[PDB]
Design an enzyme around this catalytic site. Sequence first.
Site, PDB file in Angstrom:
ATOM      1  CG  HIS A 193       2.801   5.130  -6.524  1.00 29.83           C
ATOM      2  ND1 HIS A 193       3.601   4.886  -5.428  1.00 29.83           N
ATOM      3  CD2 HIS A 193       1.523   5.072  -6.080  1.00 29.83           C
ATOM      4  CE1 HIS A 193       2.840   4.707  -4.363  1.00 29.83           C
ATOM      5  NE2 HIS A 193       1.575   4.812  -4.730  1.00 29.83           N
ATOM      6  N   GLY A 231      -4.711   2.469  -0.574  1.00 26.10           N
ATOM      7  CA  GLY A 231      -5.181   3.833  -0.498  1.00 26.10           C
ATOM      8  C   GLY A 231      -4.489   4.676   0.550  1.00 26.10           C
ATOM      9  CB  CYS A 260       0.166   5.539  -1.259  1.00 24.72           C
ATOM     10  SG  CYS A 260       0.520   3.813  -1.372  1.00 24.72           S
TER      11      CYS A 260
END
Lengths: 306, 306
Positions: free
Chosen positions: B41, B143, B145
């Site tokens: 993503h 942030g 991820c």
Amino acid sequence: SGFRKMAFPSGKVEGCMVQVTCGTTTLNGLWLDDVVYCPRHVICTSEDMLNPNYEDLLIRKSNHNFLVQAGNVQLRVIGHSMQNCVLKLKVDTANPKTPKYKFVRIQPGQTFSVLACYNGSPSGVYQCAMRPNFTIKGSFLNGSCGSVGFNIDYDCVSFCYMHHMELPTGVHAGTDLEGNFYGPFVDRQTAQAAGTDTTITVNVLAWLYAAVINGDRWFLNRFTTTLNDFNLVAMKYNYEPLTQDHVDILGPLSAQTGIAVLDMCASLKELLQNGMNGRTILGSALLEDEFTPFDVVRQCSGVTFQ
Amino acid sequence: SGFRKMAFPSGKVEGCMVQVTCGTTTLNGLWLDDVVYCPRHVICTSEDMLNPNYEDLLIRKSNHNFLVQAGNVQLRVIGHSMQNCVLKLKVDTANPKTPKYKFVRIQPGQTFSVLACYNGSPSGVYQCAMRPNFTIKGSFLNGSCGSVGFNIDYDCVSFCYMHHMELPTGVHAGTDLEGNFYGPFVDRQTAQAAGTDTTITVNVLAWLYAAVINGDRWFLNRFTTTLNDFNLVAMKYNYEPLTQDHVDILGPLSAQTGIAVLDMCASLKELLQNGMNGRTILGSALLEDEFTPFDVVRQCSGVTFQ
Ligand SMILES: *[C@@H]1CC(=O)N(CC)C1=O
Ligand SMILES: *[C@@H]1CC(=O)N(CC)C1=O
């Protein structure tokens, strides 16, 4: 979201741990530039520790009696000196991995990460607080002496603790990196009294603000209080007194959440007198005091390091 | 002595974190050999996340639409492919800091360390367990991820988790390093149900053995039980059932302490039915289930790593 007892990343410190041997005693040393720092009781046998005369023991040691090993890399000791309770070993090789660094002596209630080491090799990392009685509640086995505590400021490592001793009560004592013990303790195997271990109030308040930020609000009550009235209750429960400096440090958390510091104090007061009644806060059933106000801000804002 | 929630030393992983940008989305990637791994993503906008068609979004991306940065070092992407929910970016430079490593898919109840990162830079490290409902109770801001979970075996890093999502309930979900989610979750911003979060019984028992080893013995009772009788009580309290495999894994702790596993089970049963009554165990007022039997042995024996 979420809230965890978070340690600093340990990579910068891992590169500084060495093994120091003198006679049959092996512990950990800290290699920065061309000096290795380690506990002076590396020169002791197990019998010496009951009543050591360090000056007299150190006189029968020469540079070549200290073996310093960094992996399979042999460092040559070209000078040695005792500074308070630490030995400074001058070696022939500067550590190429020397981070940018500074020695700091911390105050009780401040927090830091410990890199637990055995034989110069890292075992694990955890976060803890210097207790108000100048002990730490660590996790240390035989051979862990010389493991260090540290904080990170961007690219700068602040070394604040070197492990020296386990007290007969199971808590831990050590020095700053200039070799001065925290607290009244000495590097002798003798019964030593620690004082009352009080709760670090300003840290409990910071953690209550972290709870509100993360959605745990049940403990917020209808009351307010004054700093004298709160400190009257705090002292009965072996809590540290709160001062105006503490109120000032909590200001940014009060602003972000809209909850006045004294209002949060009245919530804490009710928790002290009525207990948690089977409730939890941030997954704990006890009031947690190992987050400073700065820890909370750091974790809730996402500060990073080199 | 002492017992702490200890994370693995993070140095070997710190050297593998990079920043990955695609369009206006920036997260973390894992750079091993000449491949960077990151959540797919990264190719989504905030609007795309409500209902993403990843294959269709990925078709409008070329190698040069992915910016990968390691410090101020620019990596060139020479190939990209989607494997389940992770992107594999082939770069022109092998990571010189690549540790020795292996990808593992863990089981619920196992523990690992998370290195929380923002913009490719480490923020902190903490230990956690994969819950039985395949979530983790992490600490993650926007942030984070692409931050990874890992274990260390001597000189070998086992990567087991990559952070992808925060559920609307505040818990966290992610994939193994082959891009397969743990649990029934998908990388879409939609309401997703997690099941019951049960307590990991074999870990609670391991932690009770750690307590006995460290001197907390008050909870040891006069009773014994059977595995069926215990599992009957366990299930009423949303505890995982204990099996014979679990009894086998606890064997070394039973040997060291002289307390039969089934005896420890009867102590736990009384704690579940009568509560702690204001007592603590290893400084906690709740039964702790984020230490595996192997964690306990490791910390009580002083295992070290490269
Ligand atoms: C980090 C590097 C260093 O020596 N300092 C001096 C004040 C730092 O802040
Ligand atoms: C660590 C290095 C590696 O690839 N392995 C393979 C089984 C390890 O145990």
